[PDB]
Design a protein around this ligand. Structure first.
Ligand SMILES: CO[C@@H]1O[C@@H](C(=O)O)[C@@H](O[C@H]2O[C@H](CO)[C@@H](O)[C@H](OS(=O)(=O)O)[C@H]2NS(=O)(=O)O)[C@H](O)[C@H]1OS(=O)(=O)O
Length: 132
């Protein structure tokens, strides 16, 4: 990924229903289709080669996957906030937990997050297009 991918804030558009990933100041995570929603502007940070954290800019919190597969957002970049970022077949990205290595960040067609343990590499739910 080129430097601009990290420098410019992104909205993460999920292929599964067209929901943008939304991170809230209370720690909640969900999805919304409205592009002007104030809590869908995210910052991708290169933590290591191929590894990112995902910060909700307004929320001032980082996306975390918990040990039971839930998505929340933390004030600090804990070990639950590191994700392998990978490019898939139609140029959407996936985000796989560095801690729970079989589980992906994902949104259901209902607009709520999909439990990590119910995700998989071939699901539409795990595909996100970073948009400006
Ligand atoms: C092609 O897109 C995937 O498959 C869709 C589908 O099978 O209709 C759709 O899946 C959602 O609806 C189906 C049918 O009701 C559910 O079986 C599925 O739940 S499940 O994955 O837990 O079994 C449900 N997936 S969800 O939206 O992620 O909750 C969906 O557009 C795509 O599903 S996928 O799992 O993201 O690939």
């Amino acid at each position: 990924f080129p430097p601009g991918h990290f420098k410019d804030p992104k909205r993460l558009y999920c292929k599964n229903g067209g929901f943008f990933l939304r991170i809230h100041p209370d720690g909640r995570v969900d999805g919304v289709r409205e592009k002007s929603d104030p809590h869908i502007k995210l910052q991708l940070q290169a933590e290591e080669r191929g590894v990112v954290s995902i910060k909700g800019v307004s929320a001032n919190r980082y996306l975390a996957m918990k040990e039971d597969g839930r998505l929340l957002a933390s004030k600090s970049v804990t070990d639950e906030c590191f994700f392998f970022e990978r490019l898939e077949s139609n140029n959407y990205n996936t985000y796989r937990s560095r801690k729970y290595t079989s589980w992906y960040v994902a949104l259901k067609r209902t607009g709520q997050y999909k439990l990590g343990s119910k995700t998989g590499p071939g699901q539409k739910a795990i595909l996100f297009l970073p948009m400006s």
